[PDB]
């Protein structure tokens, strides 16, 4: 359900089996995981 | 490497527990209220 835009790239996890996002330093998202297993880092700032 | 609090019902630190020592002439199983949720123990050889 999470929409957004931005820059898709892979991940440098330590990721749980039960968990999805990712929020990283003041409730910003940061990173996710597919709905088919492709944990990914997620950019929003295309650029500015 | 957040720093997050949140709000919630805790166990709080360093708190009273009315442990409850059974051994091979002691059974203990009274009645107990839950009041707003119970944290619990149970130490065991082979999770009984």
Avoid: W
Avoid at chain 1, 7 to 35: E, N
Avoid at chain 2, 16 to 40: E, L
Wanted: net charge negative; with cysteine.
């Amino acid at each position: 359900g999470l929409t957004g835009t931005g820059v898709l790239t892979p991940s440098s996890k330590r990721f749980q089996p039960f968990q999805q996002f990712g929020r990283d330093v003041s409730d910003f998202t940061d990173s996710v995981r597919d709905p088919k297993t492709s944990e990914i880092l997620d950019i929003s700032p295309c650029s500015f | 490497d957040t720093l997050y609090l949140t709000q919630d019902l805790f166990l709080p630190f360093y708190s009273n527990v009315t442990g409850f020592h059974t051994i091979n002439h002691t059974f203990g199983n009274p009645v107990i209220p839950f009041k707003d949720g119970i944290y619990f123990a149970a130490t065991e050889k082979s999770n009984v």
